[PDB]
Design an enzyme around this catalytic site. Structure first.
Site, PDB file in Angstrom:
ATOM      1  N   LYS A 105       0.962  -1.083  -0.051  1.00  0.00           N
ATOM      2  CA  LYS A 105      -0.033   0.035   0.095  1.00  0.00           C
ATOM      3  C   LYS A 105       0.648   1.206  -0.077  1.00  0.00           C
ATOM      4  O   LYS A 105       0.648   2.224  -0.629  1.00  0.00           O
ATOM      5  CB  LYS A 105      -1.136   0.075   1.214  1.00  0.00           C
ATOM      6  CG  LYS A 105      -2.202  -1.004   1.078  1.00  0.00           C
ATOM      7  CD  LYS A 105      -3.166  -1.046   2.257  1.00  0.00           C
ATOM      8  CE  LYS A 105      -4.153  -1.914   1.825  1.00  0.00           C
ATOM      9  NZ  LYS A 105      -4.990  -2.087   3.196  1.00  0.00           N
ATOM     10  N   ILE A 106       1.960   1.348   0.650  1.00  0.00           N
ATOM     11  CA  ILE A 106       2.732   2.456   0.692  1.00  0.00           C
ATOM     12  C   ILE A 106       3.561   2.708  -0.456  1.00  0.00           C
ATOM     13  O   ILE A 106       3.365   3.851  -1.218  1.00  0.00           O
ATOM     14  CB  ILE A 106       3.916   2.124   1.774  1.00  0.00           C
ATOM     15  CG1 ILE A 106       3.154   2.311   3.341  1.00  0.00           C
ATOM     16  CG2 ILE A 106       4.789   3.498   1.849  1.00  0.00           C
ATOM     17  CD1 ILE A 106       4.091   1.934   4.457  1.00  0.00           C
ATOM     18  N   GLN A 107       4.013   1.814  -1.219  1.00  0.00           N
ATOM     19  CA  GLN A 107       4.826   1.765  -2.357  1.00  0.00           C
ATOM     20  C   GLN A 107       4.068   2.420  -3.484  1.00  0.00           C
ATOM     21  O   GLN A 107       4.328   2.936  -4.357  1.00  0.00           O
ATOM     22  CB  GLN A 107       5.518   0.282  -2.945  1.00  0.00           C
ATOM     23  CG  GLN A 107       6.707   0.115  -1.626  1.00  0.00           C
ATOM     24  CD  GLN A 107       7.868   1.345  -1.421  1.00  0.00           C
ATOM     25  OE1 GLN A 107       7.941   2.262  -2.232  1.00  0.00           O
ATOM     26  NE2 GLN A 107       8.351   1.274  -0.374  1.00  0.00           N
ATOM     27  N   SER A 108       2.815   1.580  -3.543  1.00  0.00           N
ATOM     28  CA  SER A 108       1.887   2.056  -4.715  1.00  0.00           C
ATOM     29  C   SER A 108       1.640   3.744  -4.262  1.00  0.00           C
ATOM     30  O   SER A 108       1.346   4.409  -5.297  1.00  0.00           O
ATOM     31  CB  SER A 108       0.540   1.378  -4.663  1.00  0.00           C
ATOM     32  OG  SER A 108      -0.439   1.916  -3.910  1.00  0.00           O
ATOM     33  N   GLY A 109       1.331   3.885  -3.199  1.00  0.00           N
ATOM     34  CA  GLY A 109       1.236   5.494  -2.917  1.00  0.00           C
ATOM     35  C   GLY A 109       2.467   6.338  -3.238  1.00  0.00           C
ATOM     36  O   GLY A 109       2.155   7.497  -3.746  1.00  0.00           O
ATOM     37  N   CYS A 148       8.150 -13.424  18.136  1.00  0.00           N
ATOM     38  CA  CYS A 148       8.940 -13.494  16.592  1.00  0.00           C
ATOM     39  C   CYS A 148      10.188 -14.324  16.736  1.00  0.00           C
ATOM     40  O   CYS A 148      10.472 -15.022  15.616  1.00  0.00           O
ATOM     41  CB  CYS A 148       9.218 -12.110  16.338  1.00  0.00           C
ATOM     42  SG  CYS A 148       9.209 -10.838  17.997  1.00  0.00           S
ATOM     43  N   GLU A 164       9.459  -4.932  11.678  1.00  0.00           N
ATOM     44  CA  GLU A 164      10.089  -6.265  12.301  1.00  0.00           C
ATOM     45  C   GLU A 164       9.023  -7.572  12.226  1.00  0.00           C
ATOM     46  O   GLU A 164       7.936  -7.278  12.546  1.00  0.00           O
ATOM     47  CB  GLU A 164      10.616  -5.999  13.828  1.00  0.00           C
TER      48      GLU A 164
END
Ligand SMILES: NC(=O)c1ccc[n+]([C@@H]2O[C@H](COP(=O)([O-])OP(=O)(O)OC[C@H]3O[C@@H](n4cnc5c(N)ncnc54)[C@H](O)[C@@H]3O)[C@@H](O)[C@H]2O)c1
Ligand SMILES: NC(=O)c1ccc[n+]([C@@H]2O[C@H](COP(=O)([O-])OP(=O)(O)OC[C@H]3O[C@@H](n4cnc5c(N)ncnc54)[C@H](O)[C@@H]3O)[C@@H](O)[C@H]2O)c1
Ligand SMILES: NC(=O)c1ccc[n+]([C@@H]2O[C@H](COP(=O)([O-])OP(=O)(O)OC[C@H]3O[C@@H](n4cnc5c(N)ncnc54)[C@H](O)[C@@H]3O)[C@@H](O)[C@H]2O)c1
Lengths: 481, 479, 479
Positions: free
Chosen positions: B256-260, B309, B275
């Protein structure tokens, strides 16, 4: 380059510059009210280099206020920016204004080009650059969480009251030191330069202004020393004296300040940061390389007419080497018209004449060389060497601030005793000339309290920022009882 | 001590806390407009601990606005004072609110008192205390006159856009880390906690306020993870994602960020600090102390139901030592449900894992595989043997008390290290006495785990990602 | 432990110790020539703990002579050995003489065991141990060949004249500080202790001797404060005053020294190192945790009857929080005379303060104000409200368990900080949660206290003042 200097010298030589007060960034001239002190060339006293505006009482009250009003904005100006002003000043003096500053110091304080360069360029710029580095370290405190879990920071505030800077004639760089050290630490300053350094001192002031010094942070108030002083010292906000000059003047300032303190004139206990001269000594051990000791003694005694707080003015010679040493020295002196440069003013000239003339009537003194003087053109006193029959003669202890060396010859075997006499007999600097390590070690230890700076086979002519701040600690606790 | 804790437990147990949004320092309740998430006790899931207000699109926009409005007064607040707030919060949590925080974490995230103490007291406090110390080093920059005569200072500024903190359920301390690291460095923060750590996370928020956090510096906006995320990411001033959680969610966020970015809707290239998890491994060499390796594996795998994790979830055993290792392990597991998994969705995934194992000829349940959701989300320790080393159960992350074991012929130890290296892990461990084998594994597995442990369970500078350096150089010479 | 202490207590209690001068390592008794000061128990003032020999003019001259005669052998004694004496004395006090020192301090200065332990064991030992460490850093100077080819060493020498230590009654450790700091750096010392700490101070002296302090390095000359001081100051070799005590006495000493300077009777400009008192303040912001602020104020003000240079004695409360703060305070003071003040002269001054408060329309005694000198010098905790912030009770130092409180309208918090800044303090504190208020006060009050505390009671490099730097520079080139 020498053409550039010549041009600067001629500029100031041709006319007489009106030197104003500088209060709150404004140049204040005599304007038909104030007295004018005529600063003349000590090498040529008919020649007026400057007509210096003299500070009235009013002017002084205004300067104090200016410094008070500039205070918050000055100590809130980040260290980076306060520093930039001083570094910029140093580099303008080293470049743009190199020749003007050289000419002013040379003409006004009676220095040749090399003496001037070392003073008003090299040392001056060194004071600023080094203080910026030292202060930078000082301010490099980081908050820490302690073992107990408390959160601590330490900050260095300037003094709460204002600093009064009283600067001597002999080094333009000392004037820079006296005003710049406290100012860098966030203090504001009222500054009364020496009457006979006014030209170069004013130049320093205008350079600081061009470099961006805010109004009122330093206030340049030449005037009658006693009058200006009494008025500055009358203000409840007086915070510190920053002084370099004679012992006698310091004592007066000191007395005047302490009067005020006990009478409770002041909001705070003022800080007195003063550097005085001394009667600096050269001690020659029989094992010394005589030639080096002689040359060092000439330079240490006679350079700039002995007008250095660190200047050699008393010499101790072993009898077995006296004739050779003194013969050498008189030969070199006679080789080197007949004056290496002027002394600063008539008062100093007259004092030195009294010294020379009194030595002639004193049966416990013998003038071995020199004693020449001539005031017809400038204040010229020649190199003089005076032998004393006894080591405790006043000439071995009275500060002359001139090209006058007093010499006492001691029997070789009594070297240790002569160290004891010097110790038992108030100096800033001292030197031993010797090869023998046992004698050096011995004098090194025995004369530990006799000089703040001790030299081995070198002329005796060759931090403070913390005195203009106080530490304030803040400790936060997170636990709730 | 135990009585103070019991009281805290009985408090949160007696009734349900209404957990509000905190936006610009104000608590925002459902006010009959917003949805609610019932956070329940994973050990007793009929017991509702909190009704959690869910942020609207408008709330999120107001959160983003609050963060932007507080930015200048925050980064202009001296480091000494910014630090003080976080140190105070750590101390308040360690003392004044110790029992409430333990109870919120125990009840809300299904931890016993020891697990809760290690997380929400000790690690949480350590995060704040160590960040303050590291940051103080960073900020310790003095100006210098270079050789060229110029006069230089360097300063660290925060990111220009705001930070979006998305925090996981499993450690209260990780939520503290995710908001505290950026905020300490003068960033402001829009924070969407995990639905199933809302209670402890809210307490953390209220403690930060009590410790003096100025309004809008950190904004607490629980709500639907997708809707909240989509609205946060819509804002042109988005400056960084600070995320801890699953790989798949990270990839979703990353996408979603990269498309933005490519569509150009951001003033800056946002920083993405994430992480994620791993399929962490224990590798046993035949020279290992077996008993130590067994106990370390039990602890590394089953502590907090494997919900770390860094949890071990795959184990490589030499054939000659297999029977002995497994016998000890099963006997030890026998001699002791250690606690619940976090929610029904995790319970159901784990049931599928276990049930599928029963139908796979290459898998064999050697121990455990029991589950019961009648009272809480309880899945017992489970050890499944895989008959090939690249079986999906050796690589798929289950985040639950399930260990997959592969047994290799002793002579093939070197080959097994290659199989691990040539086939995405956070942590890994070798158990061995033989130094040659340890060194070989140490080097061959150098890219197979960020933290490598020798004879220790695999469960055992980030500040600079949240600032930017800016140099000022002043010159004094005039041309 | 308690039995060893009781024995020490009963020892000093059973009879009276003759306390002699110690000059050049010899004890000098009254010998039917000198006056005596009876040091009594301030909690039971008919009980004479010690008859204290009082120095004559001749004794003082002999003390000054002893100090001058020991000077060279002392500063020539290696730092290692000078330090050793002070470390030994600290250890002897911490162990061998622990119970005697506690008893002397408790009985002589009116301290309970806890106050005595903190002072005459812990702080005293810390002074010596930390000074030794700091000094060792100072002395760690190696010679260097400069760029110019010269060969330099720097050495710290002691002051050339002797040091006059004038120490207060209130901390045994402060007497140790005042003599130990100069002596460690190779100075010699003429020391006039407080009449009312003679017993503990004498013990300190005898411990220093046992630890090997060479004769005449420190000279113990109790006596009439004016006569002793005037004779010490008459000497041309006077080099420094090291003083801790009241402002008025300091000003008296300061005056006498400076007049000596201008009349020229000293070989050097003496150094004047003085620690005086303050009217230390607690400032409460309306955002403060009230309970913590109350307890910190009770402790900061009334601990050891307010007889600390750093004691809180003025308090600024916001009107909205006043009733609550004061109620808690009075209730807490109620639930608990905490101990006596030091002597009758202090008792009588404090009675006047309290009685005058009853006749002043701008003052009101809110709590306490009780006193009784029938057995010891007992003045109870007293809280007086002033109706203007610049009332004399807000600035006059009482050194007793008296707190003056001014209540300000909440909106005038900034104004109140100005009132403090624009109207001589050692310590001060703000209690608040709000960081803006904390920062504003931190900066506005930067000149109003040397130690500023945040949410802590206001009760919570000097070596370089006792040496002078001397550089040796050697040059090898021959002109
Ligand atoms: O070297 P130097 O010859 O410049 O040393 P100095 O003592 O003559 O002069 C040093 C400085 O003190 C100032 N000064 C001189 N006499 C003073 C006095 N009586 N009161 C206050 N200030 C005084 C001078 O003007 C000068 O700036
Ligand atoms: C690590 O920690 C992880 C465990 O933590 P977790 O179970 O909370 O992991 P997670 O990926 O499920 O959840 C972590 C965080 O991301 C949020 N989130 C969940 N789905 C999202 C989505 N589709 N879009 C945006 N945000 C979303 C959650 O609400 C929470 O704040 C493990 O997977 C391990 O690998
Ligand atoms: C600090 O500590 C102080 C408390 O200590 P204190 O009560 O012992 O204070 P103080 O000023 O009364 O006495 C301190 C020291 O000074 C000596 N002294 C007292 N009067 C003197 C005088 N007129 N001339 C020379 N010396 C004199 C004392 O005997 C003692 O050694 C407080 O006032 C506080 O401000």
């Amino acid at each position: 380059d020498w053409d550039l200097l010549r041009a600067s010298l001629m500029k100031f030589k041709s006319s007489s510059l009106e030197v104003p007060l500088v209060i709150n960034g404004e140049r204040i001239y005599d304007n038909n009210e104030r007295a004018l002190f005529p600063q003349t060339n000590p090498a040529n006293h008919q020649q007026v280099l400057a007509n210096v505006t003299q500070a009235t009482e009013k002017d002084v009250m205004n300067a104090v206020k200016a410094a008070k009003d500039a205070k918050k904005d000055w100590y809130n100006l980040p260290f980076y920016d306060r520093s930039a002003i001083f570094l910029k000043a140093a580099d303008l003096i080293s470049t743009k204004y190199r020749y003007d500053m050289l000419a002013a110091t040379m003409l006004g304080q009676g220095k040749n080009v090399y003496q001037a360069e070392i003073d008003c360029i090299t040392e001056l710029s060194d004071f600023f650059r080094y203080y910026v580095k030292y202060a930078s370290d000082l301010y490099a405190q980081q908050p820490v969480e302690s073992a107990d879990g408390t959160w601590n920071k330490a900050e260095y505030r300037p003094l709460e009251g204002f600093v009064y800077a009283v600067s001597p004639f002999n080094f333009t760089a000392i004037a820079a030191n006296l005003i710049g050290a406290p100012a860098l630490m966030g203090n504001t300053v009222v500054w009364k330069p020496s009457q006979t350094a006014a030209l170069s001192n004013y130049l320093l002031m205008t350079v600081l202004e061009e470099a961006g010094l805010p109004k009122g942070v330093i206030n340049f108030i030449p005037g009658d020393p006693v009058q200006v002083t009494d008025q500055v010292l009358a203000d409840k906000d007086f915070g510190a004296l920053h002084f370099t000059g004679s012992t006698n003047v310091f004592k007066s300032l000191y007395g005047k300040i302490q009067s005020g303190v006990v009478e409770g004139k002041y909001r705070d206990y003022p800080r007195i940061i003063g550097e005085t001269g001394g009667k600096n000594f050269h001690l020659v051990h029989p094992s010394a390389n005589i030639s080096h000791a002689v040359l060092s003694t000439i330079r240490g005694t006679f350079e700039f007419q002995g007008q250095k707080c660190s200047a050699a003015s008393r010499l101790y010679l072993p009898e077995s080497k006296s004739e050779e040493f003194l013969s050498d020295m008189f030969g070199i002196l006679q080789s080197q018209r007949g004056f290496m440069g002027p002394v600063i003013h008539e008062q100093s000239f007259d004092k030195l004449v009294k010294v020379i003339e009194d030595a002639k009537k004193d049966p416990e003194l013998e003038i071995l060389y020199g004693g020449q003087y001539d005031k017809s053109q400038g204040w010229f006193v020649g190199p003089t060497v005076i032998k004393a029959k006894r080591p405790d003669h006043p000439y071995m202890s009275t500060e002359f601030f001139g090209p006058i060396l007093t010499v006492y010859e001691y029997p070789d075997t009594e070297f240790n005793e002569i160290c004891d006499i010097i110790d038992n007999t108030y100096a800033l600097t001292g030197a031993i000339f010797a090869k023998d390590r046992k004698a050096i070690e011995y004098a090194d230890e025995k004369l530990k309290f006799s000089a703040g700076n001790f030299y081995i086979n070198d002329k005796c002519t060759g931090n403070i920022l913390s005195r203009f701040v106080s530490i304030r600690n803040t400790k936060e606790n997170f636990y709730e009882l």
